[PDB]
Every structure is written in structure tokens, then in C-alpha cells.
Amino acid sequence: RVEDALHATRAAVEEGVVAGGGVALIRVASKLADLRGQNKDQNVGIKVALRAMEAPLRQIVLNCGEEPSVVANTVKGGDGNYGYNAATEEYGNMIDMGILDPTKVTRSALQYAASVAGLMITTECMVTDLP
Amino acid sequence: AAKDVKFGNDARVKMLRGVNVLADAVKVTLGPKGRNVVLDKSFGAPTITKDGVSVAREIELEDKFENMGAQMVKEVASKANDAAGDGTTTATVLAQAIITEGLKAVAAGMNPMDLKRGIDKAVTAAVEELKALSVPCSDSKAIAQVGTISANSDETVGKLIAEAMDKVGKEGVITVEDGTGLQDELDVVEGMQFDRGYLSPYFINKPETGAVELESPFILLADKKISNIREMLPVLEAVAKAGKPLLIIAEDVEGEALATLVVNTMRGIVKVAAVKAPGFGDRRKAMLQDIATLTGGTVISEEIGMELEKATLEDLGQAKRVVINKDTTTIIDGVGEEAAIQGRVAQIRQQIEEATSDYDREKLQERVAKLAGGVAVIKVGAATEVEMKEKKARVEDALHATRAAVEEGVVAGGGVALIRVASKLADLRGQNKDQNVGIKVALRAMEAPLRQIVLNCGEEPSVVANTVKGGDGNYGYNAATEEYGNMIDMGILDPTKVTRSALQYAASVAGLMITTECMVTDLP
Amino acid sequence: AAKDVKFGNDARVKMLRGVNVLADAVKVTLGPKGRNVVLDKSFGAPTITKDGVSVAREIELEDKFENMGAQMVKEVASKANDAAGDGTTTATVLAQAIITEGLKAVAAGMNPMDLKRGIDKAVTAAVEELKALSVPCSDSKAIAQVGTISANSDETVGKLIAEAMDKVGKEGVITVEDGTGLQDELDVVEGMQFDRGYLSPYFINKPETGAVELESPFILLADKKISNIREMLPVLEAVAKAGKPLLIIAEDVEGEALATLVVNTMRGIVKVAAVKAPGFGDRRKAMLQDIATLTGGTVISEEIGMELEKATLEDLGQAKRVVINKDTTTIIDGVGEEAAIQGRVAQIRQQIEEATSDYDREKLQERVAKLAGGVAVIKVGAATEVEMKEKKARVEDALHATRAAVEEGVVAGGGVALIRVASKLADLRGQNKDQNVGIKVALRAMEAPLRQIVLNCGEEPSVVANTVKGGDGNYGYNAATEEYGNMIDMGILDPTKVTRSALQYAASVAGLMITTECMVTDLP
Amino acid sequence: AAKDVKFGNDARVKMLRGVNVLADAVKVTLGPKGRNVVLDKSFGAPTITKDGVSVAREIELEDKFENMGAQMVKEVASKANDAAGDGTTTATVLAQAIITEGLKAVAAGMNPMDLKRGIDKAVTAAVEELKALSVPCSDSKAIAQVGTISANSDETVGKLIAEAMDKVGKEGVITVEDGTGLQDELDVVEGMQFDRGYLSPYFINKPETGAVELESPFILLADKKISNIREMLPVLEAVAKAGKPLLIIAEDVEGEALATLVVNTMRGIVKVAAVKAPGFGDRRKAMLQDIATLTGGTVISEEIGMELEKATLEDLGQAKRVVINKDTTTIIDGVGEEAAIQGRVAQIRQQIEEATSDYDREKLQERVAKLAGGVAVIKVGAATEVEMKEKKARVEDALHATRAAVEEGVVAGGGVALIRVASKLADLRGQNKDQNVGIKVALRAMEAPLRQIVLNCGEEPSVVANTVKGGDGNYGYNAATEEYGNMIDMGILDPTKVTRSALQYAASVAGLMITTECMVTDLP
């Protein structure tokens, strides 16, 4: 527990902290609604990315046996650090509830997921050995 | 014949499966954003429609057990439609939700009978919240408002309906037919309507509405049952000549007589329609005379010793038009002289003084009401036949609807009436755990409708349901505009009566499948 | 390697099926009236048995997923036996009961987690009901009625245990072995026992008790982990000579030295058993010196710069006999000097004084207790070898059994302890309905033992379960004679510790499976 | 190893299929009109044999479950031959009748445990009836009549056996070996015989008898368990010289050592055979001294601190011949000096005077009986070794046979002893319906033997059974001459002890199988 909490606070000291339960990703995406690109296609790309950022939250909520769609929308409506505690099914400030994530973990996961998803989306050919 | 028997859960799943096919094919038309269903015709091009009622008639499955599942619920839904005029489409999704959850409870080890009582108690509770929720529709401004919305915002239709209604009264009988050209028309004519439909389909020559419509027909009135068309011949040949149809009202019409008829009017040889006399016993025969008088015919009763063979054409009563439903026959403009008529009316009316019983008095008043009350006839004007028959359609519908609204008021449309009432029923509990789950299955299913529609619009069902529930009274979501607000105010509403029937009926067939332990069918 | 993943319900069904197999094969022996199971052996005639632990040991399924379900519970079931000494067979029908109903409810759409928490509450509340229901076994008279009951009414065995425990203690280490002639001997010797077992099976030469038994072995005491059997050589040949066994007590033995021992010893090349040092940190090295002093050996610590290569036979400790369980090593009759020993006890006993803490003090008393306390040895007398090994087995068992009775007392057996405990928690409810259902699955499962037992006797379960539930305190049904009465008076009982264990372990393993949404194994 | 589990009815039927194959293959040799069975042999022509025991030994079925049914009973049947010296052939038929009816009863839904307890009460009752029916065999005139009958009417054997037994007494160790020339020899030598057999087959070099035979061997007596053939080295090379065999009498020989000798002795390198020392505890080391003195050898122990490595040929004891059975080692003509022998006999017989208990007295007298008592040696004459090896075999059998006759007497043979006892137990009843059916399954089964022999003669089983049942005492049916009369008088009889073992062992296995609910085996 020490090794983990240790590792974690490493990242907190390094990049601070944000709401966990992946509500951070949903707050961030919700602030970028007007974000657009150069041509329609890049836009669909932007909305796809923005759409993916709720996944964390939806999946979790899905796991408590509550409605993903409802909580994601409800969470999106607030501002700052307002989110949903999965452990208690209560809405409030995620940080205050203690539930949270190192700014570094939410960040790394996001950038990395987008790197690999983009590569696959642009893949046109696959070669492997015969079974 | 050799049968195939499947039992319990094994049976229940087949059934469930069949109702899933009927309901899922049907549920995509629900709401204002419903999808198209393409129904193939052996001849030509397919029919594309968004009418749930149309899709259900054509659904028939190859598996004998699944089809039994689909067909059982298909029938208990047509009854919702006969009663109110819509909700067939609604009634079905209600049933699918309950059967699916119910059967899970059962397979899961919970008791079907407790589950049924709970569901039913939930439906009963639901009907009660639905009445306090109901907003009255009595004055003709609202009748006008109701007719206009039901006719797709054509104030013309609304005016028509309110007018017809003001003329024959809220309870009055109103018929609607093709127009004589651009302009609209309303004329009350000597008539009567009883609680009796066709003794057999086939006589039907208007498939759209599933009804029989005869013009300038002869009416054979016989106080007895005609099992032998041997007696019919003379009168039928007299009806054969002149080139006019025939209506037959006898105590009953069975086998051969009815069979040869079902065949012959269908061959083009003389169009004839048969229907059971209204009521039963003594009062039935008096009501037989109540018709002979109105149309100017003569009842041919064996009692007075008159035979059918000795019938000619003057004994045959007559009118301008007659419509016969699955369960209703309506006589339009009888030739009977008013004199003869108001005198038959005066009579009944005095019998109202000699009535030594409240009941008897009510039975007599019912008849007088019918004859002197007459029948309203709306003839719809519009310029070039296409628009005319179409406006005819919108009128028939808004009319049946306004009938129901006037009978039970209106409630929020778009499936929200149902979600609101159920939200009012959460603490509703029953006599044991099993029943409680039943009440909740019922409470849950009430959201289905609303959900499916939201589903058709491309928005999330769980969100809208959750949002709408949090409100009160007639607050709901407008599927057309995707805007929340008071549903009544916006125009999306439904007659208290259709939502109530689709639900009660949904609970009946759901109660039955859920409480079924066995299925027998023919061998493939 | 490429894997096969099955998910959600699909995944839950493989598991239920595997556990059903384990459960149905095992539950048939349960009772006074249990059925024989035939377990085949590659060589010869097969084994016929009524011992649930054995059969389960043999259960293994061809289907990889089904296999996982059964093995999950087979694993946790054995832990009930290790902590109690019986009840693997009980615990089993229990996981099966919970799992069956839990997965049905989960499939019906109830929340797995809420249900797990409800079950958990039910077990907790239930263990509570169980300790109150519990009746103590303290005075050597009860150790006696009980010890005899475990021995199958051999009063001789009971006497043996109340006396053996009387010499050392309720908490007293007692070991049992072969006898010298007809008569029963008990001698207290210098000795000790710790919380560590063999570092690997294979070292086992007594597959029936699943323990290692070495007589007159050398004991190697080093203070460090040994991974290279390169360091061993100088001492292992010295042990190969004199053709005597060797017990290895080190901080831990990994990879190379451990595998080479598990093999070389599995070949008859001088027998050598390995086990971890007692405790951790500083107090660990301290206990190793206690062991040295006790056995007259020398602790070889790299810290004193000693080397295992520099070890001669003299530095080895020695004792007349050692027994190594799955989680216990016990050294019987060490050659250590009574002077050496009591002096190491004087030391430890002064430190107790200089104890600045309640914990350092507690750890120290633990140490003095082990040394000065010694180890009891029961040599069983029978006369004619067959009777001897048999009467010996009954003693080991009754010993372990009574150990549990002294510690937590006793409760009604025949699975009724469970049927009373659940019966008093009827009203236990939770925070939500799912959790509520969970309490009921747990409480329903507590009747399984009883029900199954009744069935094997060939009587009606439902009736007996009901009848039993109706009485109070320790009133039940005696499966041998089919008579109802106080279970304890009629002698059919179970240690509060074992019944508690079987139940807790069943809910643990049942609980993990329910919440399981996914399963992964190698392909076929 | 992934297992295969079969349950209830599915498992029980496989078991039945297997014992039916064993039994029908075995039942055909029964009695004097038995048929022939051919056992294929990989090299040369098949062996034709009417000896049922040989046949059961070759029987092994392919289906793991089927095989299980047969191997269980094949094994307990051999216990019948071990305890008597014949009757395997009998016992198999008895278990088959019980199992078939038993499984019928279990399957019709009757309780297995009740049935078992019922079969056993019938058997217990049967054993008692058999002792009363039993006629004693104590005077040597009868023993001679018995010996003659077992040898197939060769009076010479009857004489021999009578003489040898008169020489060592009714309980005397009597041995039989090949003769020196035409003439029967009988000589008593110093020798002893203990209750311990070979520590492993393979050491067997006379497969027909299934026993070990070493001539003029060295005897290693070691008081300690020997686990490493490392210690055996020094002494193995010394027995390797002089080319003489060896017999290891240790506390026990396990793993390492046992394996090296089983391999080596099978490779013809130094023939060695090991057996455990007699008894347990103290009296064991004492009897080891008895054997050391008897063979003129030295007990090498660790207590005195002597080692296997420090043993020379002088420590080996020595004897003219040793026979090692499945559970018996017997030493013939030890080289010990009689002063020494008789002196040991002296001290022991002086210990008996110092015997403080009855138990200690029994044990000491046992020891002296064997030593000073000795071992009778029958050397068979014949002329031309063909006849000689034959007459020798007939002696081993009539001897073992006669042994049973003197211990418990004899009863009618031809399977009628069993039938009489059963006809007398018709009224045995139990506690409930099921146990009764059981007593009857048993009572029905004791006729199997007789019916089968009768079948083999080609007569109607039902008939002979009815008829035999009608008489009393030893009146039965002589299968060889097809005449009814006194079985005893006509020469057809059986040692009461063998009919007994066959019955008791048959019901035990019948009961266990009938009380089996599950079977576990490896995957093919």
C-alpha cells in the first residue's frame, strides 16, 4: 500500500490532482464543445475523442447498476470539480469526497489511448503468419 | 389430429420469442419519429407504413408455439383499438415489457399467481392515478381543440366534430362519409345504432377500416334464426332484381345460411350483410320493431306466423346507408315516416310512465334515444377527390378520438401519462415479495412506451425518463421538438381512454402468459 | 499462450455446472446415512469411500470453465478442513446452495454486489447466532464426552485426549504416534511447534494425513534464504551418511535448492524436508536460537559470517521426531540440554521484565510457552498392527476435533446448528431489495446440510427442515435413529469452530463467483 | 489428470456390467461339471483352464467404470482364497446375485443403507446356521478322510497330512516340498513362521502359488527401517559372492532400497526378498532375536549402534529353505544350535513364569510354540517328476483345505451348505420393508452357487434347488453322479471356513457397491 500510495503521490506532486471516477475527462471534454478542426472529417474526429472521454464515467456507473447516460449528462451540467461518487451514489465535489486521480494518470492514459487508437484507425493493411 | 406438446419454461420461452418478433417489428413506428416498415404484397410493390396496427395484422410466424405467443397478444391489442381507437401500437410494447420481466421472475423461481395479482393491482392503481390525471373535455371549445389536434391541426376537422357533436350531443351517433364537392356538410337523419357487429367478415368491402358499407340496401327483419337459406330464396331474388344490396337482421344466422351468404355476396351475386338483433329476450323483439319502424320494413316473426318465403319486397325495410363494424351496425337515414317514427317514440316514451322499475325505465329510454335522436352525418368537402377521401380519413379518426376524450378526458401523450402515473405508484406494495416484484415489473413497463419513442428519435431513453419523472402533472417531453414542458399545452396528448385500455389489456394477456404452464399445438 | 474468454452469464453457467458436479458427488456421503463413492485407481481395484474430503480431492472436469468453478470451491473448501479438521463436505453443499440461487437472482437482473453484501451480513449475523447457540467445552469432563464422541464412542480415546490435554493444556501441543505394545502411553517431552509448514509437497510421505514425518533427523539451522544447493553440498553428504533424514529451517528456500530437494528426496536420496523460519524480522532470528538451544544445534547465520559449506554434523540440531503439516512444523523431543533449555527460558523470562511494551512482552511469553511447555506424545496401544494404526487415526482426528471444541465450544450437528441459526435471522434485512434477496439466499443455504442429510436417509427434507425449525435452542433431528430431540444430548454434534468455518468459506467462494462477470482459460 | 465422474444410476450400471463380465467368465468352471475357458498368452498357445481363480486374475475390462465394477469384487474374492485356499470361484457367484438384486432394489427406489444392513443381518444369521450345520473335524481319522477327499481320493495324501499334523499338532506349521525319490518323507525341523509376507511382489519366482521360495539363503536381520540401499551395499556384495539368495527382515524396507532390490533381484543378480519383522513395539525386537538365534544370525540395530555397513556373513543367519506368501513368511530348518534355540525357549518359558498379565503370557507362549515347536516337512514321493510335481500340488491344496476343516469343521459341498442355511433363514426379518427385501436378496443369493453347478451339468436349476431345499441337515445333490443324498456321505463336502469367507466377503462387496452413489476415473 505504501509502494502504491507512494508512486501515486509522485504524480500528484508532479502534476497535481483531478476528480477520479474519470469525471475529470468528462469535465474537460464538456469544456471543449465548440472545439472544431479544419474540415468536417477532423470535426467528427474531435467529437469522437470528446465522446470517448465519457467512457470512464459511463463504464463505472454502469458497474454500480445505475444509468450511464443519466449520470454522464447530470455530471456534465455542473462546473469545476462537481461529479459522482461511485462508492456512495452521491453527487458532490469529487476532491472533497476524497475520490480522485493524479493529474498525471488521467493525462497519460488519454494521450496514449489516442495515440494507439489513431494509429489503428489509419491502418490500411495487416500481415501475419499462417496458423 | 396428432398434437405437439411443450411445457413450462420451455413453452414460455417460445412464447416470449414470438411476442418479441411481433412487438419489435411493431415498436419502431411509435411516436413522432417512428420508422418505416415495408410489408410485401404478392402483387406488385410493397406497402410502406408507419402504422403499428397495420404491421401487427401481417405478423404471423412459422413456429406454431411462437406464433401462438404473437397471436395471443396481437388479439388482446386489437381489443384496445376497438374500444378507444388507438394504442394497439402502444398496448403491444406494454405487454412485451411485462412478459419479459415476469417470466424472468418465474424462471428465477418466483410464483406466477402472486406475480399476476401484483401486476394487476399495479394496473388498477395505475388506472386510478390516471383518472385524477385526466383533464376533462366537455365543452365544445375543447371538443374543437381535440378534434383539431387529432386531425393533425386541421381546424376544419375540429369545427366539423364539435358541430356534429353539438347537434347530436356528446353521446349522439355520428357517421362520416364522402363529400359532394368542396364545402363541408352536416345533416341529422332518422336513424339508429345498436350493440351488434357483422356475423362474419368477408361481407366487408372496406378493408382499410374493416367495416361493411351498403348504399340504398334492403333490410330483411326476421324475429327468428335463419339456418336455412331455403326460406331466403324468394326474398333474395326479389333483392336480386333492381340491382340493390340487402341487410339482414335476424335473431341469428348460422351454418349454411350464413355460409352460402359469406360466399355469394363475395361472388358479386347481390351484396348482403347479416347481423344479430340487439339485446336478448322480449326487449330484443321490441327493438326489432324499433327498426322496422325507422326504415319502414316489416318484422317477419314466426310468432305472428309469418314465413320468410312469403316475404316480398314491401316487407323489406330501407335506408340510404348502413355501416357495420366488428361490433357495431349503424343505420343512416331511414325512409320510415316520422309519423310512424315519432309515434313509435311517443309509445316508448309513455311506457316510461308505466315503468314500475328503474331498470325497465332505463331500457325504454335507451330505445327512444336511438330513434328520435337520429344520426349525424358529416359529408366532407375539399376540391378534387384525392384530398376529399384523405380529409375523410382524418375526420373518421379525430371523431373516434374525440368520442373517447369526451368519455374520459385527455392525458399527456408520448407515453408520459403512463410514466407519471407509475411514478406516483412507487410505494404501492402487495401481499408477498413475489407480488412486489410484480407491481414493480408493472411500474417499470409503464416506461417502455415513452422509452421506445425516445429511442426512435435518437436520444437516450434512460435520461429522458429520469428527467420527466422528476416533474409533476402533465409535464413531459415533446418527441417532435425534443422540448420539455407541459405535454397538453404543446399538443401531444392521448385520450384518457386509449392509454387506460392499452394498459389494462396489456396486463390481462401479460397475466395470462405469465401464468401459463402449458402449450399444445398441431404437428408440423 | 492463446486463451479462451467467456463472459457474463455464459461464463457463470460453466462454473455453476462444475460446482454442481463437485457438489453432487460430495454431498452424497453426508450424514449417518451417507453413500459410497467409487474412486478408480490406475492400479488394481478401486477405492470405495464415504469421506467427502477424499472424493473432492479426486474431482476434476474435462471442460476448462466448469473446471474453474469446481476447483474454486474445492480450494476454499479445503481451507475449512485445515482450520477445523472436518466440514469440507458441509461447506460444499453450502457454496452450491448460495451459488445456485445467487446466479439465478443475478441472471434475473439483481445487483451481484448488493446481494454479496446481503449474504455477507447474513453470515456475520449467523456466526453471531452461532456463538450464542454455542455451548462451551472447557472442564476436562466435556473434553472427555466430546473426545469420546469424535472417536466413535471409544471411551478409551476420550480418556486419552482429556489426559493429554490435561498434562499440557487446552492450548497444549499434543502429537500422536504409533504404540510400543498393548497399552496407552503419554510422555511429555522437550519440544516445540510453529506457524510454518513444508515449503512444498512431495516432501510428504504420509499422503493420507497429508503431512511429512521424519524420525531422528538432523536439523539445519541457518539465518538466511537458501537458493543454491551449492552451499548445501558439504552438509547434505554428511546427512547422506548415517543414512538419517534432515530438516531444513531457514529464512526461506527458493528455485534451485528447493527444486533439487523436492526431487532428490523424491528419489530416496537421504530424505530432506524444508520449511520457513517462524515469525519475521528480529524476533525471527531470536526464535531460530530458541530452536537451536532446544535441539542442541548451531544457527548458521551469514551475519556471524558462518557458512553452510563450513557446516559439519555437530552444528546440526537433532530430535527424535518432527511432523510438518500444510501450515505447521512441530519438533518432538529435541536433544537440547535441559540446562541449556531452561537457561534460554530464564533469559526469555527476564526480558519479560525489561519489557517496555505490551507487544514485546506478548511475543516473549509466546516464546517461553513454547519451550518450557514442551510437547505431549501419545503412543497409541492397540495390539496387532492393524488395530494399532486404525485406533491411531481415530486419535488424531478426535484430537483436532476436541481442539476446536475447547476453543469455541460445540453446537448441534446433523446440520441443524445451521438451521437454527438462520431461523433466528429471519428478520434480518439490508439496505436494499437486492441485498434483501441476498440475506434470504444465505439463510436458505443454511438448511442445505440438514436437507441433504435427511435425503440420504431417504426421508422428506421439507418436513424435517420445517419440524426442526419449529423447536428452539439445540433441538433437531437425529439422522442415525430418525428421532427428534436435543442434538447435543443425543451426541450428534459439531464444534462451533467447524460449522462457523464451513459457512464463512462457502459464502466467500459463493460471493466471488456471483460478482464474477468474466472468465479466462487456455484453449483446448 | 482431468477426471471423469459418473453418478447414481448411470455409475451403478457400469459397475454391474463389469462384475457380470467377471462373473459369467468365472462361473463357468464351477463344480465338477464346469466348462472350459481359454486365456490367451502372447507366446504360443492359449491356456485352457477350469480354474476360476486364474480366470478372474486375467480379467480386466476396457471401460474405466466397468473395470471398476469387476476389480473391486476380483480383489475381495482373492481375500476369500487367502483366508481358505479355495472358493474364489464361489464367492464371485454369491456377490453377483446380491449385487444384481440389490441394484434392482436400489433402482426401484428402495434405500441402499437399509438394504445393506439387511444383507448383513442375513449373512450374520447365516454364519450362525453354518456353524450348527457344521460338523467338526478334530480326530486324525477324519483329517485323513478329509485329506483323501481334497487330494481327489488319493488316500496317500490323507495319510501324509494326518501324520504330519500328528507330528506338529493341529496348529503346527506344516510345509510341503518336492520329494527325493519314490517314497513319502516326513521330517520335523527347527523353523518358525510369522504373520508377515513379501514387501512387494516381483520377488515372486513361483507364480502358480504366488509365493516366494529361496533355498539355502543368507538372512539379513536389521532392527530399523532401511531406506537407502546405500547401507545394503557392503552386505550385497558379500551375498553376491557364494551365489546365495538373501531375505531382508527389517522393521520395513521403503522406497530407495525396496526399489533397487525389486529391480535387481528381478534381473537375476543376487536373488533377494524382504519382509517386515513380526508384530510391533517391544515384542518385535524380541522375536527378531528369536529369529536371529534360530537362523544362527546377528540382529544388527542402531540402538546398540551397529550398522548395516559393519555386517559380515557371520551376522547373516542361514536356513535350508524359506517360503514367503502374500502375508506369511516361514523359515524352514534354521542352522541355529539347539542349545541356543532351546535356551531361548528356556528364558521365554521362564518369562512366561514372570508373566504379569494374561496378554503377556499369550504372546510369550506364542513365541516358544513356534521355535521349539518347529516346522514339519513333507517331502512327496512319486517316481518320474511329472507325477511328483503333481502329487506335490495336490498335497499343498488338501493341506490348506484340511487346515480349514480342523479349524471350523466341514459342511455339505456342491453349494448345498449355503442353500440349507438359507432355507432355514426364510423368516429373518429386519426393522423395515427395505431391510427385509435385503434379507431376502441375501437368502435368494445363497442358491446361486448350487443353481450354477446344476446348470453346468445341464439340468434344471430351479428343480434341484426346490428338491434340495425340501430335505434337512446335509442332504444335498451330488453333481457328479446326479444323485440326491447325503453330500457328506458321498464325498462332496467343503470346509465350513471357506463357505463362510465366500459368503461374508460377497455381501460386503455387494453391500458397498449397492451403497455407492458415485464413481470417479481418469479420462481414456
User: In a 3-state reduction of DSSP, which class is residue B3?
Assistant: strand
Interface size A-B, in CB pairs within 8 Å, comes to: 13
D18 touches chain C (CB under 8 A): no
Among B427, B429, B437, which would you mutate to test the C interface (most chain C Cβ atoms within 10 Å of its Cβ)? B437
> In angstroms, what separates the C-alpha of C21 from chain B's closest C-alpha?
21
- The reply to whether B87 sits in an annotated binding site is yes
CA–CA dist B71, D39 (Å, integer): 70
CA–CA dist D522, C465 (Å, integer): 38
Q: Do D519 and C39 touch (CB under 8 A)?
A: yes
Q: Residue D200: count other Cβ atoms within 10 Å of its Cβ.
A: 16
Backbone phi, psi, residue C491, to 5°: 70, 0
CA–CA dist D311, D306 (Å, integer): 8
Q: Do B104 and C105 touch (CB under 8 A)?
A: no
Judge contact between C162 and C141, C-beta under 8 A: yes
- The reply to whether C494 sits in an annotated binding site is yes
Interface size A-C, in CB pairs within 8 Å, comes to: 3
The Cα angle at residue B254 between residues B252 and B256, in degrees rounded to 5 = 145
Residues 6+ apart with CB under 8 A from D515: C35, C36, D112, D113, D115, D116
Task: Indicate the DSSP class of residue B313.
Answer: S
A77 touches chain C (CB under 8 A): no
Report CA dihedral (D37, D42, D45, D46) to the nearest 10 degrees.
Answer: 0
Q: Do C109 and B107 touch (CB under 8 A)?
A: no
Residues 6+ apart with CB under 8 A from D365: D352
The Cα angle at residue B404 between residues B51 and B208, in degrees rounded to 5 = 35
C59 touches chain D (CB under 8 A): yes
Residues shown for chain A = 131
Chain C residues touching residue A65 (CB < 8 angstroms): 111, 113-114
Considering only the beta carbons, identify the residue of C59, C243, C384 that sits closest to D228.
C243
User: In a 3-state reduction of DSSP, which class is residue C517?
Assistant: coil
CA–CA dist B284, B278 (Å, integer): 6
CA–CA dist C434, C115 (Å, integer): 5
Taking CA–CA distances from B104, the nearest residue in chain C reads C108
CA–CA dist A27, A25 (Å, integer): 6
Chain A residues touching residue C111 (CB < 8 angstroms): 65
- The reply to whether C31 sits in an annotated binding site is yes
Strand runs labelled E in B260-401? 272-276, 317-324, 329-334, 375-380
Report CA dihedral (C214, C216, C222, C224) to the nearest 10 degrees.
Answer: 0
CA–CA dist D337, C119 (Å, integer): 80
Report CA dihedral (C451, C455, C458, C464) to the nearest 10 degrees.
Answer: 10
> In angstroms, what separates the C-alpha of C123 from chain B's closest C-alpha?
22
Instruction: Chain A: list its partners (3+ Cβ pairs within 8 Å).
Output: B, C
User: In a 3-state reduction of DSSP, which class is residue D323?
Assistant: strand
Chain C residues touching residue A60 (CB < 8 angstroms): none
User: Strands D493-495, C518-522: parallel, antiparallel or unpaired by DSSP?
Assistant: unpaired
Among B9, B432, B433, which would you mutate to test the C interface (most chain C Cβ atoms within 10 Å of its Cβ)? B433
Q: How many CA atoms lie within 13 A of C486 on its CB side?
A: 7
C-alpha cell at B207: 378493408
Instruction: Chain C: list its partners (3+ Cβ pairs within 8 Å).
Output: A, B, D
Instruction: Chain D: list its partners (3+ Cβ pairs within 8 Å).
Output: C
Edge-to-edge order in the sheet of strand C47-49: C47-49, C36-39, D516-522, D3-7
**What b/e sequence results for D171-190 when a residue is b if at least 16 CB atoms lie within 10 Å of its CB, and e otherwise?**
ebbbbbbebeeeebebebbb
C-alpha cell at C386: 492393524
The secondary element (H helix, E strand) that includes residue D238 is helix D233-240
Considering only the beta carbons, identify the residue of C33, C48, C271 that sits closest to D227.
C271
Residues 6+ apart with CB under 8 A from A90: A84, A97
- The reply to whether C209 sits in an annotated binding site is no
CA–CA dist B25, B18 (Å, integer): 11
Judge contact between C454 and C440, C-beta under 8 A: no
Judge contact between A124 and A111, C-beta under 8 A: no
C432 touches chain A (CB under 8 A): no
> In angstroms, what separates the C-alpha of C111 from chain A's closest C-alpha?
7
The DSSP bridge partners found for residue C185 are: C379
C-alpha cell at B4: 405437439
CA–CA dist C185, C179 (Å, integer): 7
Residue with cell 401481499: B431
The secondary element (H helix, E strand) that includes residue A4 is helix A2-15
Cα dihedral C104, C106, C108, C114 sign? positive
Q: Do chains B and C touch (3 or more CB pairs under 8 A)?
A: yes
The secondary element (H helix, E strand) that includes residue D186 is strand D185-189
Instruction: Residue D188: name the closest of D374, D395, D345 by CA.
Output: D374
Query: How far, in whole angstroms, is CA B234 from its chain's centroid?
Result: 36
CA–CA dist C462, C447 (Å, integer): 10
Q: Residue C140: count other Cβ atoms within 10 Å of its Cβ.
A: 14
Q: Do C59 and D5 touch (CB under 8 A)?
A: yes
* Packing angle of the helix pair B385-408, B496-514 (nearest 10 deg): 80
D264 touches chain C (CB under 8 A): no
Which residues 88-147 of B are in CB contact (within 8 Å) with C?
A: 104-105, 107-109
Judge contact between C194 and C328, C-beta under 8 A: yes
Taking CA–CA distances from C515, the nearest residue in chain A reads A63
CA–CA dist D402, D405 (Å, integer): 5
**What is chain D's alpha carbon radius of gyration, rounded to the nearest angstrom?**
25
Interface size C-D, in CB pairs within 8 Å, comes to: 121
CA–CA dist B189, B338 (Å, integer): 11
3-state helix, strand, coil in chain D (%, to 5): 50, 20, 30
Residue with cell 469446481: C70
This structure's resolution (angstroms)?
A: 4.5
Judge contact between D90 and D413, C-beta under 8 A: no
Chain B residues touching residue C103 (CB < 8 angstroms): none
Chain A residues touching residue C8 (CB < 8 angstroms): none
Chain C residues touching residue D74 (CB < 8 angstroms): 45
* Packing angle of the helix pair B88-107, B496-514 (nearest 10 deg): 30
Q: Do C105 and B105 touch (CB under 8 A)?
A: no
Chain A residues touching residue B451 (CB < 8 angstroms): none
- The reply to whether C515 sits in an annotated binding site is no
- The reply to whether B343 sits in an annotated binding site is no
Backbone phi, psi, residue C45, to 5°: -85, 150
Taking CA–CA distances from C109, the nearest residue in chain A reads A65
A73 touches chain B (CB under 8 A): yes
CA–CA dist B448, C327 (Å, integer): 58
Considering only the beta carbons, identify the residue of C24, C40, C267 that sits closest to D521.
C40
Considering only the beta carbons, identify the residue of D2, D7, D359 that sits closest to C62.
D2
A65 touches chain C (CB under 8 A): yes
> In angstroms, what separates the C-alpha of D181 from chain C's closest C-alpha?
42
CA–CA dist C382, C318 (Å, integer): 29
Instruction: Residue B191: name the closest of B94, B31, B336 by CA.
Output: B336
Q: DSSP letters along C208-269, please?
A: TTTBEEEES-EEEEEES----TTTTHHHHHHHHGGG--EEEEES---HHHHHHHHHHGGGTS
Instruction: Residue D20: name the closest of D81, D61, D80 by CA.
Output: D61
C-alpha cell at D249: 527382515
Instruction: Residue D75: name the closest of D51, D45, D94, D53 by CA.
Output: D53
Backbone phi, psi, residue D496, to 5°: -45, -35
CA–CA dist B220, B298 (Å, integer): 8
> In angstroms, what separates the C-alpha of C514 from chain B's closest C-alpha?
15
